[PDB]
Symmetry: C3
Amino acid sequence: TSFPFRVCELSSHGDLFRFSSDIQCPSFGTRENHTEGLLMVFKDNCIPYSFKVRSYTKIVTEEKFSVESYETDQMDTIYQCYNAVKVYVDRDGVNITVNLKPTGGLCNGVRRYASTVNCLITDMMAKSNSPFEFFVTTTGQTVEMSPFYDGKNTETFHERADSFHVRTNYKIVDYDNRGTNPQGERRAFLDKGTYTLSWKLENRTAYCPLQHWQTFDSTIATETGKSIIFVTQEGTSLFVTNTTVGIELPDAFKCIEEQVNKTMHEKYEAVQDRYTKGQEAITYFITSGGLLLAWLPLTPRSLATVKNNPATVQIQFAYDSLRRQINRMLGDLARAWCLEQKRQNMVLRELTKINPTTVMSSIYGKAVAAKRLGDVISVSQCVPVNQATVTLRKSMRVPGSETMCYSRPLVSFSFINDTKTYEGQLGTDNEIFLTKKMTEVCQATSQYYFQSGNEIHVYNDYHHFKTIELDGIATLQTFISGCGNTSLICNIDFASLELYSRDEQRASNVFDLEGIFREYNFQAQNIAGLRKDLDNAVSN
Amino acid sequence: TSFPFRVCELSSHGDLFRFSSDIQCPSFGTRENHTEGLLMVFKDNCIPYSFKVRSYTKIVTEEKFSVESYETDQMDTIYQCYNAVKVYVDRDGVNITVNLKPTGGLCNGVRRYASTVNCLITDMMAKSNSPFEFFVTTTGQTVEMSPFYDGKNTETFHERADSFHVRTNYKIVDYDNRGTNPQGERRAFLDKGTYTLSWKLENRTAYCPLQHWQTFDSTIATETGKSIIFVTQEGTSLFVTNTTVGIELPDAFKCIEEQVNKTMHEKYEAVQDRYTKGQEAITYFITSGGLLLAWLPLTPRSLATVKNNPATVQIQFAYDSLRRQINRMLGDLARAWCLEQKRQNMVLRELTKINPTTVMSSIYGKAVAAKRLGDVISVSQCVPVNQATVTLRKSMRVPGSETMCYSRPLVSFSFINDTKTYEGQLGTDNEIFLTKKMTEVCQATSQYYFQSGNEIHVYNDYHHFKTIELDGIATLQTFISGCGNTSLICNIDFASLELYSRDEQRASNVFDLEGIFREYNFQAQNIAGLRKDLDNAVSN
Amino acid sequence: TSFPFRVCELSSHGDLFRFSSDIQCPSFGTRENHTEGLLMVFKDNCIPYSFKVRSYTKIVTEEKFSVESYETDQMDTIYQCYNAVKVYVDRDGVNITVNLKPTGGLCNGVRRYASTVNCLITDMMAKSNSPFEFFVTTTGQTVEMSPFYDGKNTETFHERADSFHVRTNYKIVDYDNRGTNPQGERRAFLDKGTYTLSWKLENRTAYCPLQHWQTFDSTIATETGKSIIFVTQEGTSLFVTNTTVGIELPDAFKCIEEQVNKTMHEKYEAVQDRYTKGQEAITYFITSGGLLLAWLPLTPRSLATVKNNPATVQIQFAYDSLRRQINRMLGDLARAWCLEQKRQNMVLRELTKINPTTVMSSIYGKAVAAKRLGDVISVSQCVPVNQATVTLRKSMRVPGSETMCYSRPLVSFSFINDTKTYEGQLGTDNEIFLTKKMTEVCQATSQYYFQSGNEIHVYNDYHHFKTIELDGIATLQTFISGCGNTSLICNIDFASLELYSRDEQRASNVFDLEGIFREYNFQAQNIAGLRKDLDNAVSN
Ligand SMILES: *[C@@H]1O[C@H](CO)[C@@H](O[C@@H]2O[C@H](CO)[C@@H](O[C@@H]3O[C@H](CO)[C@@H](O)[C@H](O)[C@@H]3O)[C@H](O)[C@H]2NC(C)=O)[C@H](O)[C@H]1NC(C)=O
Ligand SMILES: *[C@@H]1O[C@H](CO)[C@@H](O[C@@H]2O[C@H](CO)[C@@H](O[C@@H]3O[C@H](CO)[C@@H](O)[C@H](O)[C@@H]3O)[C@H](O)[C@H]2NC(C)=O)[C@H](O)[C@H]1NC(C)=O
Ligand SMILES: *[C@@H]1O[C@H](CO)[C@@H](O[C@@H]2O[C@H](CO)[C@@H](O[C@@H]3O[C@H](CO)[C@@H](O)[C@H](O)[C@@H]3O)[C@H](O)[C@H]2NC(C)=O)[C@H](O)[C@H]1NC(C)=O
């Protein structure tokens, strides 16, 4: 499955996105003078430059400290360091050669080494996007420079110039290959006060700013005076061009010119029997969002020459009268689609307040850890756990609490290549939470169904009863079409009714957010009462 | 109204459904070679087998106990039982013949009888679905067998075989008809340790696995190599068939063969003037979701024979050129509909976390109690209350709390055929909650509008002011189209501004979930402070 | 920007709307006998009658009191009042002529004047809707009469008749123009016990009940026996008419007759070459929602006379066979649109529980303060603050709390024309909250991005780091199409993992509503434990 057992709440800081307010959907206005043509849509290119980075730090018990040049050489060559922080030493000892032992990193390709005072090394990935303004490490620390900054190149670099240096012919030793003496590299070093950071300088690579996105074989152009609106039959996509006369192609985009000549020729060749070219040269357009649109206008051949009114006039009139009706309908579909995207954006913005992790995982169709960092959402991979160790606990009653029960089953698991066993609670879709705070007052009778991939675990009275296939429980569609529409069963929790008849004040488990809201002001007044009573108890 | 006054939170466990992750929407790919034809869609049949069940239990003050065979005979014939639990007796008395009195059940057809130790009988419905793997009683107790299990039949039965027995020629007495001596039955008995359960064994009924769902009079079949995609013009429904050559009909489904011969002949007869049959026999297809699709391919007659280019060629070209364009548009509409259903499923999954009862009631268009039982939603009827007794309290200030007021109006009501009067708070759409915890700090001025079906109750200063028709308040659409778009009124709560200017720390009522979220961490730190201060007060 | 810095939570009571349950979408049923025609849709007219109102009150320390006729004359002419409340006087003094000083109102055109006992005047707007049943003042106080009630006119008036009077030739003085002696007016007075209210009686204006809404140039009418369903090609709008024979126009709507004659003639004149009129007179229809629909049926000219089968018959058959297919598709699009609106209404109803302010602001596309007043939503303008004074605080660590940090940046601001400086927290989209309760436990490392219009503020370690343009962070669409689809970075919060490995019980910041829900029952049990421990501490 694409949603394996995973811990997602450990994900600190990943790729950022924001919800676009003020999405604008055009009004077609005067809607005659449609013209057909090929549209190639080009999107800004993003290259995920992922590169291996070594982090060096001193941990002190908790203040942290960078590592100087002489000690980082000893770390990279011998994995030895010097037990002190510049002054106290571990166990209040004396400054001595202290040897780093290896330690598991939880991601693919992350390796930690850790020997009061503690030397620490972390091999880890960092990723950067096409503009190369910054790169984010697995720790979530962000560095405000290009990873290709050579120092002399004056490429984007906002950190302290004194903190950055580059050393040639640098030697680095692989921990289990200490005698192989690997080939030398050119390696950069950065001092951030909290930690030293080092990475290999790969001479910056070269790429073309625009990557091809879509080819729409027939599109309808509507000239609304200030803008051209392009309506695409494939999908329902709509493009608003802010200029009426197409711009000559900027030379930086000239890598496109071959691709457009090829795609236009290949696709026009399959269409020659139905259309003639309106222009000998492609017209280029730029959208406000920065998409480049390549437009080849085509004029349809009259049906007489496709390779009291007389028949031909009636046929051409009917054909043109229905083509225009289809074009109007496609335009209204594109406008409806634009408005629906505008409303989806708001719906997603609101659902992200309920749970960003699940919202994003549903958008992607794969497990992604999502964290709301104020007004931006960060998306990242979850921490994988090795699924052979994942075992649910058969009983979910809280040990040593006659009045408390777990509302989610306990899970025992181990991190990949980690011997230590950890315990947590099974969230939704094999998610594992490093918490045991999902508890509820033990009901006299309870039925709970928890889905763990292709199997559902059925718990009666907080004890594991059976495992059933997912097909044992109808999906929403099958439910509404099947016996979900029949006379629903009438249920009475007679125990709850008697309890309310005998103690109207009694507390009960909340089951939904709206119940939290309905209780909230009463609970806040209860807290205020606690505060006042405690202050009076202290005063007396 | 379909949303009468009701108590929904008493609903323990009803019909279960789950939100289907990984809904797959196909890509049409190579899109020529459309063919038209009739499509009959058949869906798996669900029969709601609802049957009357008698429950027997001993309640002890609270341990519960089943009832033996000799005492259940005395209950079913005389409604007498024996006051003891096998040992203590009610009022620490002595084992004696003790007579059950009748008691109201709150659902249609539920009747309770109840005389430390308490004999209890409950006539109640149980419902089961077409696979007959289990049946759920009104209490919410689920039994893991088919209600048609004859013991010897080896039909699905997972309970303890020692606990189940069947007795012939069993006699049962109706409480108010004790002299009528009803005809005998064959009745099954089950011991679940907590309770005995009994029901009449109706010889298992017979039915055909597939129920007809839809007939689509014209559909477009696209052969995408591995699958056939069926696009239906009525609605926007889409069906993905995992096989390219249609399977011969399984004999178990042969009940369909007459229905398909009839529907295909009846509907082709109205279409003969436009199409000819491509095949002499219907082709059957099965979807991954288990729908059976009956497909009659049709080939359209040329327009010449429907009962420099020459005219006929132009007419046929235009007709075929526009039919293909409509077919492409219908395919894109079906794909858009599939994606929109995929996104609706996520939206509903998230809104169910806000409030499943209201979400489900809106989906059904009728009052349904919905409870999230972990990862599955249970849907059931709400408990009806007799609407002649429902009276709102004219004042919603909390009695004996100068600083507290009710945020929802109080409701006095009686359960159907119950003399006892109960008091609660009016939730949304005539829902009644068995709680009075929806309270708020009394505002100096307040306006609240509560809708109770076709009338809105307007409360000024926590006192009932007037009742207005629902038409007195514009709907969202009428609002946005009417004066909602004008210059909105500018309001200043000057009292709130002065309060904040004079006590920046002062507490205020929360009005929405996002305000709960914004306060939550501060309230948690307040609770932690309470805990630390109380521990220090105890230590001193 | 349309979302300036603003305080929205001060908005007490504005225009009300409700979510329409039981939106009905028709079934087309028998679908032949389409007919084309022009449809004019007329909607009920709403006029926002906004008028200037003066409020008079005595504030007492806090009981409030109206002002008598002799003292209101002295307020309106000299802005003098008499320091007493009928008896105690400010500073326990003696009844004396006491002079009102001016004070800023926070809305455009609101002016307050305020000299134990405090005379108070408030010039403020009040707005009323077309039916003139009530008008709402800026304070949020609602008055149950028409503002055009002349006393003798017996126009809608539900307040106490003794409380209302009208005085001719009334003189009112402008505070800074005390010598100009403005022209007299006819002014009404109302005593509400809490406050006196006064406004100018402008003889009620006259208007026509129906305002033109839309003209749909081609629409499809389907006669479903009981109703006519109108499907409009522009947009996807659908109208259900409850009558099959159109009603003769009520005389009250006769103002429409000229507009319809003009629009029908102007639009038919552009269509004569394609259609002939089916009737010589427009047919009027009324929807259940009260829309008036003007219908001119048109019959299309045969293609022969638009100004073995023979060609003309084939051409007409093809044209009619495709027009019917387009009409069926438009009908299915209109039904899908109706169902989608029905589902949007539920989605919006649920999202309003998360945050009505943001939901409504997204619907309007402009900043609107929204407050849920039970089952109705009130919408109003937010209080503007003068944006030249808005300065974010560079540091968001809580002063004097080593363990607490602010989760939203602090904002210093001044109200328009107010010298006083106020401090609060920056909510979403330049919203300012008069609170400082959004706090969190200081994380060892934190990254937060807050958007403030066209700029994003980036805070590292609770200290302001940089400001970036909105284009520095990809929108959701650009994200999903760009590097958001690449291999996401794998992040480990190693500190969190160590903390959980060493103290499984440790508390953590909640980041979403579902985390509130997961913690809620455990926090409620913690509160209950606090209560029990405090009661035992008091008992001992
Ligand atoms: C603990 O013992 C280590 C043993 O290495 C001491 O490290 C030494 O630290 C000094 C500076 O305090 C280094 O001096 C350096 O010399 C190089 C030139 O070789 C120069 O480029 C540097 O800027 C610096 O002046 C020295 O190299 C370094 N290592 C050795 C081999 O002595 C460390 O200072 C002792 N102190 C603590 C904090 O316990
Ligand atoms: C309280 O008084 C009742 C009076 O009925 C006692 O019920 C009796 O219980 C015994 C078993 O303790 C029953 O014996 C049974 O005999 C039948 C055959 O007739 C056999 O099939 C059963 O397996 C069982 O051996 C007895 O029938 C039953 N009723 C009578 C009429 O005596 C009850 O035991 C007394 N005890 C308590 C718990 O207070
Ligand atoms: C404080 O001093 C003011 C000074 O104005 C007193 O106001 C006076 O109040 C009396 C009623 O208590 C007013 O009598 C009124 O006479 C008019 C006719 O001129 C009549 O229409 C009213 O119904 C009422 O009978 C009087 O006009 C008013 N002003 C003057 C100039 O004396 C006030 O009563 C003193 N008392 C308090 C509460 O401190």
